[PDB]
Design a protein around this nucleic acid. Structure first.
Lengths: 103, 159, 131, 85, 43, 115
RNA sequence: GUAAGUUUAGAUUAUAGCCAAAAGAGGGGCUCUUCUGGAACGGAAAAAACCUUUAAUAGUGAAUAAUUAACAACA
């Protein structure tokens, strides 16, 4: 129990100074989650797109109106309606076509 | 009630809680024991990718294999020539790490890299804020630059 | 007879402006100088902003382990650890296991520091407090 | 930060001050050839050498400044004790 | 000089192995419970 | 300024650990403040002493003329007595000198940690 | 401690401040005279005049300065 911090979450931490004292030795082997502390995968019986269709169900007046459509979209993602509004041509053209990607 | 007895209350005890350190004599044995096991780990070479912190120029760079580092100045070294960085303060493995105090011994760690390119910097505006600024009152810097590619990191069990 | 090229020199830097400013030389010239002045000033402020971001991220990482930022820095200095603030952020992000090991080392030094104060100096220097 | 503690240990308050980390060369050739001395290190080295020569010169001048006083006192002392015939 | 374009470089470092010990995620440093019981679960 | 300020007391000797005999010879002075918004006489004295740059070490003699000049700028400088544990450097060791923050000028720099 | 100074010859420009802070003098807040300091890109909320600040250069370094706040009465 030499370590001053709990070792049960991330990894076992063993801090030791070399005999000469010129170096500090740290051993950090990882710790796995106990089987008994985990739940089994749900036995009762998937692409995220499928959930989106069910979440954004078309129920009233066939396809919903623009405002209600934004409201339904806003509720699902906990976002404001202002985000969903479109933007004009001037700003749309300004966007860089090919942003650089490295690695 | 014994002398110097204070009943525990909100103000009687400090908010912080006292702790007891292990006895030094046995503690040092653990310190030695940890080194011995780690020394075996180094001897067995049970590691893959490694990361090392190296201080070059006036900056500290955390480094790993295949890393590219840019230094904004000339170095006087031809491109494609391998060079050894002599200032390493930290080296790490998958399950262990080593820390210098403030630097490790030269024997323990050897790090080598190669010079890729010598270049300068893109223009840097240097305009001035003076009444009647004028459109022909500015300067450009375009400082020199150099490119370095990390090649290898070498360690041995010399604890 | 080359006044057109002088206009082009201003235009190339003012093509991305908005309104009649981007197309009026009287206005375009003024904006270009102000834009150049703004960029020059921002160079110094950029470095300071980056340091502030590094400090904030370290505090969050330290607070995740329950350690305050001032305590961690002081203990590392007392331990002859000379890692810079920028590198400290990198270690936490990509070496959480090492960062936790660093947290324990700093915590042990702080505990030794508290022990040293309680000892009043009669006790010898701690194993991790040796300089 | 930490300058006060470093001063207590006798080290430089700023880690970037006088220390092996700053003073020592930052690299060497893979072949083992020593790296050329750093221009900043050489410039710093020159100033220290100049100061050292000044320090020695001052003390030499100081030694005469006090020693001469003793030689002027001897002249005063011998002058007081005078005789003839 | 190389054929590479000379313009402002956003980052002075390029690495193909950013992480060695694994990237931090929120579940890091979070303690588990017996049977993996979720909070407030009567069970 | 009255001389009583510079007349030491027995407690002061213990506090600063300085013996009244064998007074130190050389002063170490560094400028710690700006001369802007200061009177001209203060500005002139700093220029004469050569402390134009702040935090710059300077070698000065502990002599009455230097002492008088330092007193005028006392509040703008830090005075530390120079110590020579190993004595004055030689010509061979002139290049190995180094002044520590403790106030001791070593004549040999071995590049070994004090630890 | 430090590096300029005196004389001879030629020659112009400048010749209206501002504010802070001291010492006087009239008023009895003001009205003046005399001495000192100032002109941030930091700080006092925005802040020409107060405080910290020797010039200006690139850097994804480091140590510091001033720094809007402060913790009823019995003998």
């Amino acid at each position: 129990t030499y370590s001053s911090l709990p070792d049960d979450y991330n990894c076992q931490v063993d801090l030791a100074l070399t005999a000469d004292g010129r170096t500090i030795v740290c051993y950090h082997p990882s710790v796995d989650i106990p089987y008994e502390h985990t739940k089994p995968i749900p036995q009762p019986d998937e692409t995220h797109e499928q959930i989106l269709k069910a979440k954004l169900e078309v129920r009233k007046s066939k396809q919903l109106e623009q405002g209600p459509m934004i409201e339904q979209l806003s509720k699902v993602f906990y976002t404001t309606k202002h985000r969903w509004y479109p933007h004009g041509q001037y700003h749309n053209r300004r966007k860089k076509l090919n942003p650089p990607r490295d690695r | 009630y014994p002398q110097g007895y204070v009943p525990k209350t909100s103000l009687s005890s400090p908010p912080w809680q006292e702790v007891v350190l292990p006895d030094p004599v046995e503690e040092t044995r653990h310190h030695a024991e940890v080194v011995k096991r780690v020394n075996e780990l180094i001897a067995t070479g049970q590691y893959g990718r490694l990361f090392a912190v190296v201080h070059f120029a006036s900056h500290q760079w955390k480094v790993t294999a295949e890393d590219l580092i840019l230094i904004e100045n000339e170095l006087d070294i031809k491109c494609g020539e391998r060079i050894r960085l002599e200032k390493v303060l930290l080296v790490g493995a998958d399950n262990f790490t080593l820390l210098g105090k403030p630097l490790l011994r030269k024997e323990l760690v050897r790090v080598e890299a190669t010079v890729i390119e010598k270049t300068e910097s893109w223009p840097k505006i240097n305009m001035k804020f003076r009444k009647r600024k004028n459109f022909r009152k500015k300067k450009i810097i375009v400082n020199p630059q150099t490119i370095l590619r990390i090649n290898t990191i070498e360690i041995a069990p010399r604890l | 007879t080359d006044r057109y090229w002088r206009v082009q020199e201003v235009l190339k830097h003012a093509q991305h402006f908005r309104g009649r400013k981007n197309r009026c030389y009287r206005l375009a010239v003024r904006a270009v100088t102000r834009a150049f002045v703004k960029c020059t000033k921002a160079r110094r402020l950029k470095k300071r902003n980056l340091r502030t971001l590094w400090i904030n991220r370290i505090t969050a990482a330290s607070q995740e382990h329950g350690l305050k930022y001032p305590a961690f820095i002081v203990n590392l200095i007392k331990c002859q650890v000379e890692l810079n603030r920028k590198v400290l952020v990198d270690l936490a992000i990509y070496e959480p296991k090492t960062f936790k090991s660093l947290a324990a080392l700093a915590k042990r030094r702080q505990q030794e520091g508290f022990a040293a104060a309680l000892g009043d100096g009669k006790e010898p220097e701690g194993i991790f407090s040796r300089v | 930060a930490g300058g006060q503690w470093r001063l207590q240990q006798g080290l430089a308050a700023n880690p970037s001050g006088y220390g092996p980390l700053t003073e020592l060369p930052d690299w060497s050739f893979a072949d083992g050839r020593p790296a050329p001395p750093m221009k900043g290190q050489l410039r710093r080295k020159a100033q220290r050498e100049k100061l050292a020569r000044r320090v020695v010169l001052l003390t030499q001048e100081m030694d005469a400044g006090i020693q001469a006083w003793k030689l002027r006192q001897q002249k005063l002392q011998e002058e007081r004790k005078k005789e003839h015939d | 000089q190389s054929g590479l374009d000379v313009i402002r470089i956003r980052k002075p470092f390029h690495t193909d192995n950013p992480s060695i010990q694994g990237q931090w995620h929120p579940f890091t440093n979070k303690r588990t419970a017996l049977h993996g019981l979720r909070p407030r679960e009567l069970r | 300024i009255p001389d009583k300020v510079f007349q030491p007391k027995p407690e002061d000797h213990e506090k600063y650990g300085g013996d009244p005999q064998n007074p130190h010879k050389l002063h170490i002075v560094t400028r710690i403040r700006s001369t802007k918004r200061r009177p001209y006489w203060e500005k002139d004295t700093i220029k004469m002493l050569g402390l134009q740059k702040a935090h710059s070490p300077q070698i000065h003699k502990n002599i009455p003329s230097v002492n008088a000049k330092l007193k005028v700028v006392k509040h703008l400088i830090r005075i530390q007595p120079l110590k020579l544990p190993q004595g004055l450097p030689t010509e061979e060791t002139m290049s190995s000198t180094c002044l520590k923050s403790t106030g001791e000028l070593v004549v040999q720099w071995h590049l070994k940690p004090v630890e």
